[PDB]
Amino acid sequence: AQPAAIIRIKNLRLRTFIGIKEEEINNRQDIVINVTIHYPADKARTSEDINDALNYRTVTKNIIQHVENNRFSLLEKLTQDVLDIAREHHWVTYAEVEIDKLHALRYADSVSMTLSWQR
Amino acid sequence: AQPAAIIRIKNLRLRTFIGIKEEEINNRQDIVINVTIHYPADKARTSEDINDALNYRTVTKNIIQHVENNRFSLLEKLTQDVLDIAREHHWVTYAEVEIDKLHALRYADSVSMTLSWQR
Amino acid sequence: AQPAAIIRIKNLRLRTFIGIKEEEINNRQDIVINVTIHYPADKARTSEDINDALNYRTVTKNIIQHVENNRFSLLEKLTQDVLDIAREHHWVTYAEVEIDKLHALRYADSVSMTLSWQR
Amino acid sequence: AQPAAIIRIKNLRLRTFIGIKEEEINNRQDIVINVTIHYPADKARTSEDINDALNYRTVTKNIIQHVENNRFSLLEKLTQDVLDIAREHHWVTYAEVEIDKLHALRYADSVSMTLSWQR
Amino acid sequence: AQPAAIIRIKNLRLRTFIGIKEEEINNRQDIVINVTIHYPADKARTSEDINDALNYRTVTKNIIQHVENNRFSLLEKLTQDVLDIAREHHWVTYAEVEIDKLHALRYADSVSMTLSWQR
Amino acid sequence: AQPAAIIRIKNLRLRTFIGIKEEEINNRQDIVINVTIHYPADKARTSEDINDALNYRTVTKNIIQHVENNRFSLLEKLTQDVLDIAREHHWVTYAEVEIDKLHALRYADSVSMTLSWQR
Amino acid sequence: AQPAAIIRIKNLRLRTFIGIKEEEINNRQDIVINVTIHYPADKARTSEDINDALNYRTVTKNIIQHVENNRFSLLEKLTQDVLDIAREHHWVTYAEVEIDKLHALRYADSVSMTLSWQR
Amino acid sequence: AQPAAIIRIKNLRLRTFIGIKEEEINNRQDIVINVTIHYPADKARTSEDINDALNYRTVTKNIIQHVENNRFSLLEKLTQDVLDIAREHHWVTYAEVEIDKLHALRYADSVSMTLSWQR
């Protein structure tokens, strides 16, 4: 086998302040967050036996909480904060986070920033 | 040449019980399964030539039957169960299974669990 | 640089006979073809400075003509044939062909078969 | 960590002249561009401190300006032109560009050309 | 003003037996139900004060119950059974029900039946 | 009761020759057919039960056969031919037919022609 | 001419509290609002002439402010409040408001409430 | 019968300047035009004998030429202009024009203006 269980939180849609421009700081913007988390496949089947358990519900709760109650200057800062929150649990082997800033550029669907973490 | 034929079963849509919370155990939930199976490309051209053939139809029938006729505690148990069903045939070189649990997280399209197997 | 120009022929939608069952042989089924072709990046810019260039229009023409005017017993035979048609040209470094047999399994969007070739 | 911040400019939809055939040169055709850019993750969190930063807004600006105000003979020339525009900034580690020529083939959604650069 | 509150139950996705042919009676098929119910606008602003109220939840519960736990020979019968269930509440002025039998015709996304009731 | 049962044949996708221009006559084009047919609601609960049943399956079979096995000079002619075929059954009260000529105009999704019949 | 200009505000996506159940009151839900406003077509052109013009921007502003900054007991109250906000201006001849409470019924895409006003 | 042929030009996607604000006048915006035209059904079948015929290709050609080569202050003006170009031909019984101004309001897919003409 390939001992890596992958958890995907697809299209978490939130709104928050990103940017320094008058408008950007005055109105919330639409962003789409996608999180990919890797962790040992054996501990996965163990999810119910032990309570250290990685809870995607908690990861999401935290991300939502942190994003909605803050103002951000750069996409980079935001993407990092969420990455840190995703790889917080000690089972996390690898974690990746992509954030789409919807309609940030005119004539394009979005621009996204993706950051990852190893070990 | 890269001697691996890949079969994908795209968006098998089913309903079953997943969870322990009253609601979860009382109501079936929507899940979407995706199966990726790899096997020797040479034997692929021999699929009406050899009876010990890999039948994606059977694989599907089994999965459906197993999933619709049970109650599961965690996505992990369910995903593994299916992975085992996918990689049951002796030609299976590699097998992957991703299961989306639709609208499990509020404000998110879904959360999915992917597991795989080698050799 | 990474000297490999990738050409993608997206969702070539065709109808043809696939199967041995009475219905399958009596009615054309929908299939979606997706072809990925690689070839040297340098020759790409010089595709118009000679007279034997890779023509995605011809490849497509041949695939259509070959797929619509025939009957196929198995997905694998059909996929291989197309892959052959794809890598026919002497510039092709690599070629991949995925063919979706739409609504082949009930409750599933489709099932596809992928095959590739190197060197 | 995996020191690479990825920036994606998704579906930049533009119209321009591609081809030599009368119709091609008399009427603009629809294209969809997708740009993927990689650069050092550490500098990413330093996008305000270090003022000569990588600006996706500028990259897009140049691409649009360059594409909407020119005529192209081959998809390859155009794709390359954009690729160069993308990897123009000195932080660019890797860059990939895919360009879809919408409805270039009949019976197919589109045909795309993808080109990338390293180091 | 125009004293009619319109409640719409959008895409209620269910599976059941529809048909007489061996296959149709052996495998449940996918159907999508849409329900439109009109009722006095003035009474609408009172469903929190009174308990003789129109509960879209009860309507749904009954439809699901009735459709999943039964077998149907004709779309018309099924559509009528549902129409009666929807207009059962004494507040209902108008009621319309459409039922799509997904992929019932080959080469057509679906075929639907719509029936309505007045007074 | 508003005694009018409505049958909708949704998105019947076919290919056939439309036009007089060389290309139009040399290559089949994609068209999307939508048929709406009205007939008595009372007789509707009767097809298994009562006689000369309106078989949406026979109507479609006839449309497909006639469309695919011919060449048409104008959309209008084609839409009429289908309309006639659709209102051929003696129970038909009303019949409507919209035909999309996919990507007929550049820059637009499609152009359609709608024709209907009464009594 | 048919002297009625129609302004549509399509898919205004907002989140607010709707319901009385513990979960509905503790967590905001996703609703999609659609507004249809009619007014004399002649006055519409005199818009770059007069000052008391109908401003869809202001209407939206008010709808957003009112919806996000409050809690609602029933869909009916929310829809009415919005309807009133929509027909506030003296040019409005007819006003219609549909509100989708996304995934309010399990197994259904949404449930909506539409209300309208005349004169 | 119901002697009214309906021609729909679906989603004509164009870019042009709309508004008075610095940004709006400096950058073209995305608009989607939808045109609906009615004309006598009898004349429709004779749209191949005569040549003073209603040509949807000309209508579209005219629409585009006028839209792309001008600047508009108000949606109302733009929509009227298009409505006029569509009902220009003497066969036109009724004409309708809906214009979506994509992402005009923040938090909404768009805002559209519809205008129609009779006789």
UniProtKB/Swiss-Prot annotation, chains A, B, C, D, E, F, G, H:
Would the keyword Isomerase turn up in this protein's UniProt record?
yes
What EC number(s) does this enzyme carry?
5.1.99.7
What keywords tag this UniProt record? Answer: Isomerase
Pfam families per the record?
Answer: FolB (PF02152)
Enumerate the InterPro entries for this protein: Dihydroneopterin_aldolase, FolB_dom, GTP-CH-I_C/QueF
UniProt note: phenotype after gene disruption = Cells lacking this gene show no detectable growth defect on complete and minimal medium. The folX deletion selectively eliminates monapterin production and secretion, but has no effect on the intra- and extracellular folate profiles.
Q: Enumerate the catalysed reactions.
A: 7,8-dihydroneopterin 3'-triphosphate = 7,8-dihydromonapterin 3'-triphosphate
A GO cellular component annotated for this chain's UniProt record is: cytosol
An example GO BP is: pteridine-containing compound biosynthetic process
Example GO molecular function: dihydroneopterin triphosphate 2'-epimerase activity
PANTHER family assigned to the protein according to its UniProt record, in alphabetical order: DIHYDRONEOPTERIN ALDOLASE 1-RELATED (PTHR42844), DIHYDRONEOPTERIN TRIPHOSPHATE 2'-EPIMERASE (PTHR42844:SF10)
Q: Which NCBIfam families match?
A: folB_dom (TIGR00526), PRK11245.1 (NF008418)
Q: How does it assemble?
A: Homooctamer.
**Family assignment from sequence similarity:** Belongs to the DHNA family.
Function of the protein: Catalyzes the epimerization of carbon 2' of the side chain of 7,8-dihydroneopterin triphosphate (H2NTP) to form 7,8-dihydromonapterin triphosphate (H2MTP). Is required for tetrahydromonapterin biosynthesis, a major pterin in E.coli.
Q: What is this protein called?
A: Dihydroneopterin triphosphate 2'-epimerase
| The encoding gene | folX
